[PDB]
Amino acid sequence: SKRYFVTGTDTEVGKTVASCALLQAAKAAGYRTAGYKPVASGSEKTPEGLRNSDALALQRNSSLQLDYATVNPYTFAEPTSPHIISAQEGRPIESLVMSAGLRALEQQADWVLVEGAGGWFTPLSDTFTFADWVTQEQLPVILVVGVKLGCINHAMLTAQVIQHAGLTLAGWVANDVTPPGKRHAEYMTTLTRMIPAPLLGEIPWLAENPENAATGKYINLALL
Amino acid sequence: SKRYFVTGTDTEVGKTVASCALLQAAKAAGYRTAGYKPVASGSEKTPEGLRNSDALALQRNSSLQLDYATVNPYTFAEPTSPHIISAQEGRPIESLVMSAGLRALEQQADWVLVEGAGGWFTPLSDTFTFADWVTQEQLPVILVVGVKLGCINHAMLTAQVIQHAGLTLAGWVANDVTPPGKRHAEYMTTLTRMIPAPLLGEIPWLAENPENAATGKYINLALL
């Protein structure tokens, strides 16, 4: 089986778009897949309770029919750092619960993709970050790089810190977050040289992909 | 005397606004100040050659009357990574030239603020980054943090990598890049706990500060 943690270089690089592409590619390869987003903030009310749109995307892109809470056990409404809204709601986030949910998906899935709740150093409490949990779980990490100004710096910072944690940087995905620009090829070359992990694929600019066209085709899982 | 390198957490955190506040505070304290931006990209034509707006701000906020090229010896038009536009123009960026320009300002200034040309890992050539040069110069670093979503992660990544380079994280400046939000205080507390350097001050949201109101008052240089 297989497990990966997906993180983005910044806000609004389409991290969840890339996660969905990865999940689609894994299903095409014959895996029984599951997405896992243990912690989510920024969620809408429904008759069943709060639902986060990124967790819903991961649920919908899982090859298994998974219940929402199995994908996302901690759901907060407001779109702010987990530690802040957790404290405000009186709903502490516990590492062991996060880990138990990953184990629970491994009962059924042989390919699990895990997404966080912000970037690498996202606080979950005043003393624990999402990086702490990923490190404990020894997950291999896939970096999603939004190709835009600043991406080289952010990719390098994030890659260095992951490697310093003792973790494997398993791959990276380029997400085209804007229409094509002038320096696209040169930026891709630069990122490719500098990121110490295989480029798994590049997702085109899909103007938010309103029709939910399939993106798994952009990912080469054999490179992972 | 004193020298500092200023870097931002991301694109468009108002790094140069903070640099100008620092320079203003240093002048108020009685220093002979100079700003230095060795490398600049994104510049306008004038009869004297290309001029970069951030370098002009540093020039104008220096207490010494400095010639433009002394503030910014390498000026490229297009707003793209220095290594790319340098290669396209056939104008290589040389560490020794960057260092000579810093020495030249130290002939006249006892307080020098240095700004880069993007974030920490900004390439200058295919084999040299701005981090390499800062590390060679052993500059103490001031981090400018734009208070916005994602700032905790970016501040922590950048701080960790600076410390791992063996450099001193001398301080940080909070820049209010948006109007006040809800979680402003809690974000400031979080950043303050997590960034291993003194908070020097917080610059209010100035809607781009069209009147050039003075910002030095927001910086407490005694904390540096």
From Swiss-Prot, chains A, B:
SUPFAM superfamilies: P-loop containing nucleoside triphosphate hydrolases. Substrate binds at S41, Y187. It is an enzyme of class 6 (ligase). The active site is at K37. Keywords: ATP-binding, Biotin biosynthesis, Cytoplasm, Ligase, Magnesium, Metal-binding, Nucleotide-binding. The keyword Cytoplasm applies. It catalyses: (7R,8S)-7,8-diammoniononanoate + CO2 + ATP = (4R,5S)-dethiobiotin + ADP + phosphate + 3 H(+). Homodimer. Belongs to the dethiobiotin synthetase family. Catalyzes a mechanistically unusual reaction, the ATP-dependent insertion of CO2 between the N7 and N8 nitrogen atoms of 7,8-diaminopelargonic acid (DAPA, also called 7,8-diammoniononanoate) to form a ureido ring. Only CTP can partially replace ATP while diaminobiotin is only 37% as effective as 7,8-diaminopelargonic acid. In another study both CTP and GTP (but not ITP, TTP or UTP) can partially replace ATP. This is ATP-dependent dethiobiotin synthetase BioD 1. It comes from Escherichia coli (strain K12). The gene is bioD1.
